[PDB]
Design a protein around this ligand. Structure first.
Ligand SMILES: Cc1ccccc1S(=O)(=O)N(CCN(Cc1cncn1C)c1ccc(C#N)cc1)Cc1ccccc1
Ligand SMILES: CC(C)=CCC/C(C)=C/CC/C(C)=C/COP(=O)(O)OP(=O)(O)O
Ligand SMILES: [Zn+2]
Lengths: 323, 407
């Protein structure tokens, strides 16, 4: 009906069809704190909202009023709750409401309430058929929107819509290989479909990641994904990894490659590798390089790591004090 | 030496910390480069203006901004009309950090307003007449604890609060943020925080909650909002802090968490990003850097022998430099990054993070690092609740005089 931004918008206190209702002023007390000096339009809508809420008036006019209250403050979760009460009480068409929430999310996508509302609608309708395309449009504008990725995971998992998501992930990694949300989505998809224990899958994923590392050696996301998919089994379980990373040292180096080396060495020492001492000193040398030159922002972390490795892996570490 | 620059961000080597994009441009690298150029201008402004750098926390300006906001806000704050207890908390905490006393007149007015925000069925809403919600409930309880008077403590209906928490509890261990609302790790933290402060924790209230939080830790080492989601500083703080309250930090892989958080400090800017490959933001000075004290305490309780006894495991100096040089509005208030506007939320968390960066404490051991003028030093904050540690102790002691509702 009358859009909040319409040139001919009129205050609720001036509307004939609201004449019967006394608006309800906010009760901030005799000496207010954090008192917001609301605009006229804002205070007018919310005075009327307080009135319909207080009376629990479940009417078409109250339903339309929630649209304005939401537009004025989409984070007002009380208004959203009442709007959902009205959707059910008035038996409103839920596909019309889906059209509404898609428009609102498009304009204010960084808001918890709007995404939760959309989830409730999808649950009520048991219809996920618009979701992936809708979310894709939001991600086309902000490829890192946290709520959008979260809703996407919920939709995929709840409705088992796994079949095309790896393809979607590959598309987004092509657009921006530094997009960490997308690396996260890659792990989410693989973990819940094939899993990473399938050797062919793990192999494919490591080769792919190494290929991205070669293309963009300072991209931290690829480095974190490589570590993430290997670390629970233990980096030292993969003896070829070390040599192959050392082979990137010359013209593909980074503080990330160096840090990964330390992580490889750390696991080796934990699993009683050959040449305990040789490995230790290699690791300590690297920790020092990182702390003093290559990654000084993390000097406290790297000194802590060097200290930890020394404390438990030095030849003297298991030697009784009397010796 | 005379040629030596005492500020880490102004040293000549620091230029080597600029982004290397490997000649492959994407939206991510373009955006990072834009921030770095703006920050470099800030860093170099002294040199180009031929002045000696002096890092001063603009206390009087911040106090004026806070004192007024505690009473009245412009319509710029309409979007926070359902978060008024957060405004009370952010402002009162900032004032506490700045060691500015709270007039009893103000204290009593805050108490009375929060009473009006309290629901008959327990918890606090975003404003008077609003349904209760765990976020303003957390804020309201923190604010009342910062005030710390008998009147303030008495505002909280403890019996109804517990009932409210039970009404939000889910079978999988998680909590709804509010009735008919969303679930994420924020709710676990909000619930743990208010229940522990007010001594209403029953034997089964948090059954399954530690395990649910641990499922939110992912392949990155940090914690996402729900299981499966990308690791983020805000959710990671909520997850670890709730586990500390529950005495269940060991449920997490603390080592992968430590590696993840330390990697979130930006080598050039000195501040922290909220997740991998996104931008620095002053409020993560708290959410991210606040994890380091939590991890220190946790690792120490495990008898970790290699822990520093004077510093947190992040660059305390670089963080203070970022906050002092980049995050202050000359008119008063702090902000996200240069070019953004001041707001009470960033004022709260930038100062909270500055305090953490200034103060190391591990039992008997204490060490301060105060960059810039000595008057820059803030009051310490408790890394779990983010109110003064004195206020935490005083509140917990007071409520322990009461029995857990139901006995
Ligand atoms: C944490 C909180 C507290 C009260 C109300 C809302 C929120 S929030 O969960 O919506 N939160 C804070 C929302 N936010 C936006 C934000 C914070 N940092 C960067 N941004 C864009 C705010 C900005 C200013 C104020 C004030 N006054 C209050 C919230 C989201 C968020 C946190 C960190 C980075 C980005 C987004
Ligand atoms: C107790 C309590 C309520 C704590 C709040 C915890 C907190 C800070 C959560 C942040 C969640 C979130 C929506 C991040 C994305 O914002 P973004 O994409 O605009 O920011 P980004 O680029 O820095 O991830
Ligand atoms: Zn912020």
């Amino acid at each position: 009906f009358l859009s909040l931004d319409s040139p001919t918008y009129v205050l609720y206190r001036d509307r004939a069809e609201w004449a019967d209702i006394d608006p309800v002023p906010q009760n901030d007390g005799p000496s207010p704190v954090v008192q917001i000096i609301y605009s006229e339009k804002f205070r007018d809508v919310y005075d009327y909202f307080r009135a319909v809420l207080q009376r629990d008036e479940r009417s078409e006019r109250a339903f339309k009023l929630t649209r304005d209250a939401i537009e004025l403050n989409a984070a007002n979760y009380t208004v959203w709750h009442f709007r959902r009460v009205l959707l059910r009480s008035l038996q409103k068409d839920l596909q019309e409401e889906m059209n509404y929430i898609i428009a609102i999310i498009e304009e204010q996508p960084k808001n918890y309430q709007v995404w939760h509302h959309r989830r409730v609608l999808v649950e009520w309708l048991k219809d996920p058929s618009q979701e992936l395309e809708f979310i894709a449009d939001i991600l086309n504008q902000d490829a890192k929107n946290y709520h959008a990725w979260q809703h996407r995971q919920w939709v995929i998992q709840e409705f088992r819509l796994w079949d095309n998501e790896l393809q979607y992930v590959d598309q987004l990694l092509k657009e921006d290989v530094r997009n960490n949300s997308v690396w996260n989505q890659r792990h989410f998809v693989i973990s819940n479909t094939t899993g990473y224990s399938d050797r062919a899958v793990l192999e494919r994923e490591v080769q792919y990641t190494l290929e991205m590392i070669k293309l963009v050696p300072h991209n931290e996301s690829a480095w974190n994904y490589l570590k993430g998919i290997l670390q629970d089994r233990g980096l030292s379980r993969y003896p070829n990894l070390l040599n192959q990373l050392l082979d990137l040292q010359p013209s593909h180096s980074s503080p990330y490659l160096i840090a990964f080396l330390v992580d490889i060495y750390e696991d080796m020492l934990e699993n009683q590798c050959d040449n305990k001492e040789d490995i230790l000193n290699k690791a300590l040398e690297l920790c020092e390089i990182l702390a003093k030159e290559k990654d000084t922002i993390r000097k406290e972390y790297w000194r802590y790591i060097g200290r930890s490795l020394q404390s438990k892996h030095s030849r003297e570490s298991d030697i009784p004090a009397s010796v | 030496p005379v040629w030596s620059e005492p500020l880490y961000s102004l040293r000549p080597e620091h230029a080597r910390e600029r982004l290397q994009d490997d000649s492959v441009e994407t939206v991510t690298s373009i955006e990072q480069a834009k921030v770095e150029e703006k920050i470099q201008e800030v860093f170099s402004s002294y040199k180009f203006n031929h002045l000696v750098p002096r890092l001063v926390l603009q206390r009087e300006k911040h106090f004026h901004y806070l004192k007024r906001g505690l009473r009245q806000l412009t319509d710029a704050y309409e979007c926070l009309d359902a978060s008024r207890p957060w405004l009370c908390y952010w402002i009162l905490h900032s004032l506490e950090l700045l060691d500015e006393p709270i007039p009893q007149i103000v204290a009593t007015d805050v108490c009375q307003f929060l009473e009006l925000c309290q629901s008959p069925d327990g918890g606090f809403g975003g404003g008077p007449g609003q349904y209760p919600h765990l976020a303003p409930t957390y804020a309201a309880v923190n604010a009342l604890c910062i005030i710390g008077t008998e009147e303030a403590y008495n505002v909280i209906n403890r019996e109804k609060l517990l009932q409210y928490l039970y009404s939000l509890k889910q079978p999988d261990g998680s909590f709804l943020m509010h009735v008919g609302g969303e679930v994420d790790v924020r709710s676990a933290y909000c619930a743990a925080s208010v229940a522990s402060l007010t001594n209403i924790i029953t034997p089964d209230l948090f059954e399954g909650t530690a395990e649910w939080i641990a499922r939110c830790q992912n392949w990155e080492g940090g914690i996402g909002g729900v299981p499966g989601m990308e690791a983020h500083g805000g959710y990671t703080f909520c997850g670890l802090a709730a586990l500390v309250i529950l005495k269940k930090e060991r449920s997490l892989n603390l080592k992968s968490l430590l590696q993840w958080v330390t990697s979130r400090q930006m080598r050039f800017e000195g501040g922290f990003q909220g997740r991998c490959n996104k931008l620095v933001d002053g409020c993560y000075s708290f959410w991210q850097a606040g994890l380091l004290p939590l991890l220190h305490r946790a690792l120490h309780a495990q008898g970790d022998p290699a822990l520093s006894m004077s510093h947190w495991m992040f660059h305390q100096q670089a963080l203070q430099e970022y906050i002092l040089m980049c995050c202050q509005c000359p008119a008063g208030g702090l902000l996200d990054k240069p070019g953004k506007s001041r707001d009470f939320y960033h004022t709260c968390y930038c100062l909270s993070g500055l305090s953490i960066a200034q103060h190391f404490g591990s039992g008997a051991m204490l060490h301060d690092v105060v960059m810039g003028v000595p008057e820059n030093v803030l009051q310490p904050t408790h890394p779990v609740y983010n109110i003064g540690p004195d206020k935490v102790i005083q509140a917990t002691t007071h409520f322990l005089q009461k029995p857990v509702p139901g006995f």
